[PDB]
């Protein structure tokens, strides 16, 4: 019960001592058990996610928190099988699923055969295509056709909804082809908010070129997915103690992809944060600490975005800093700190993000541990905080990227293998957790959260300097 003392859990070198990786692992086992009892996933709008919410809520209530379970409307998307695409005119041709074409995430289902009509294309190296970005691009578009649209300038959602409003029966978006690396298939989405009502697929650039030059082309397009208008939930709790006008917020999404239990992504962040919150119940913070477990992150940051957008302006101004923990137990981990200062990738967070990054950096360095930057281009639940000008930072142990030889020297593990080879897969279970990674990153989570709970001055100083 020594870690029930406020003297330990209130201070930045005390909280990490009391936040033990073995206790995070026990919570990870519980999430694993939950997934196993609910068909192997904890995905948004599933019983696995609901049972994860119940677990987090009950844990927080037993620690003395009041808990807000915040519902929001949500259109779930599930691909139910591979797509089909074949030419019927002028000649029969069968294109290959996941080589010539793929789904847009959040597309509607459909089965359509129709003439293919290119819309305002701009081909070739160095093009700046605006294909389909304006309703006027469809000036000569015949209703019922398949719109053949080039990637470029505006969102896929906008291209597809413009085509739908112009009466398209379906949409084929092909990669832009302005550089050699923008000619293949990619992970692309029309967004959870897509409402075009028609199917949308993505195709390679060279296929787009050939189709756009094929007189009388007709394509038979089949998209086998389900979208379901439903709801899901964020879980939010805050300390009773601490200044309510200077809130330190920490977040970790609680949903998994549909394909697996999501123990590293993001059981790891969820369980470390839950352990910290339980310990902080006894702390004496100067600044209020708010904890969020986000829903529907894997569908496009839906829960965290909804939370921020729905905050009254006066309440939004009270959040001084946001810390995001999304994947911190990677089997082949590296020590990645969000690149708030843009020193590695050229994107700066809102004023104060450099200070948060610097706090993480100094903590790893003090411990003789290596670290390096990772990108912050709206990849996780800080995104809407970023858009709202709120300072943020975070920790990451790596996902599908391949470990370099240097990083294996710095962090151990295997060069040329993914940081997490079970990323978004059935095998992302309890066995997919590296407890050294959990130890190192839950330590730093606790240190920086505790530090800011006592003083946000490092953040305040950058805010002040930015104002002049």
């Amino acid at each position: 019960s020594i870690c029930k003392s406020p003297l330990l859990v209130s201070t930045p070198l005390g909280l990490p001592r009391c936040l033990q990786a073995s206790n995070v692992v026990k919570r990870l086992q519980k999430l694993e058990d939950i997934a196993s009892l609910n068909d192997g996933n904890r995905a948004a709008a599933t019983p696995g996610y609901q049972a994860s919410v119940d677990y987090v809520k009950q844990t927080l209530q037993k620690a003395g928190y009041k808990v807000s379970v915040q519902p929001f409307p949500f259109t779930a998307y599930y691909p139910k099988g591979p797509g089909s695409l074949s030419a019927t005119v002028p000649q029969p041709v069968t294109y290959e699923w996941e080589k010539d074409f793929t789904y847009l995430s959040q597309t509607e289902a459909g089965d359509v055969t129709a003439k293919v009509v290119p819309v305002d294309l701009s081909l070739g190296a160095g093009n700046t295509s605006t294909s389909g970005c304006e309703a006027e691009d469809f000036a000569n578009f015949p209703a019922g056709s398949i719109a053949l649209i080039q990637r470029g300038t505006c969102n896929f959602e906008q291209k597809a909804e413009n085509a739908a409003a112009a009466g398209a029966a379906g949409v084929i978006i092909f990669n832009q082809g302005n550089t050699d690396d923008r000619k293949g298939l990619e992970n692309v989405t029309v967004g959870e908010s897509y409402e075009g009502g028609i199917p949308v697929i993505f195709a390679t650039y060279d296929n787009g070129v050939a189709w756009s030059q094929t007189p009388d082309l007709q394509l038979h397009l089949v998209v086998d997915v389900v979208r379901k208008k439903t709801e899901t939930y964020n879980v939010v709790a805050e300390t009773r103690r601490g200044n309510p006008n200077n809130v330190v917020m920490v977040g970790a999404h609680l949903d998994s992809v549909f394909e697996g239990p999501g123990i590293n992504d993001n059981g790891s962040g969820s369980a470390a944060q839950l352990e910290m919150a339980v310990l902080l119940a006894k702390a004496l913070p100067v600044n209020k600490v708010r904890f969020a477990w986000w829903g529907a992150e894997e569908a496009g940051l839906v829960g965290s975005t909804h939370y921020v957008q729905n905050l009254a302006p006066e309440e939004k101004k009270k959040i001084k800093a946001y810390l995001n923990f999304d994947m911190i137990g990677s089997p082949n981990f590296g020590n990645f700190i969000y690149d708030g200062d843009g020193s590695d990738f050229g994107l700066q967070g809102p004023p104060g993000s450099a200070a948060i990054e610097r706090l993480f950096e100094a903590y790893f360095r003090l411990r003789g541990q290596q670290s390096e930057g990772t990108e912050i281009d709206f990849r996780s639940d800080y995104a809407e905080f970023f858009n709202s000008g709120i300072a943020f930072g975070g920790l990451f142990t790596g996902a599908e990227g391949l470990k370099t030889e240097e990083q294996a020297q710095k962090y151990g593990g295997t060069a040329g293998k993914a940081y997490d080879e079970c990323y978004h897969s059935k095998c992302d279970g309890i066995a997919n957790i590296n407890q050294d990674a959990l130890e190192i990153h839950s330590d730093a989570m606790a240190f920086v959260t505790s530090w800011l709970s006592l003083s946000t001055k490092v953040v305040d100083d950058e805010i002040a300097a930015a104002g002049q």
Binding site: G300, L301, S380
Partner: peptide, 9 residues
């Protein structure tokens, strides 16, 4: 530009 896992444009 990303918004989470996927490119939105």
């Amino acid at each position: 530009e990303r918004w989470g896992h996927d490119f939105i444009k």
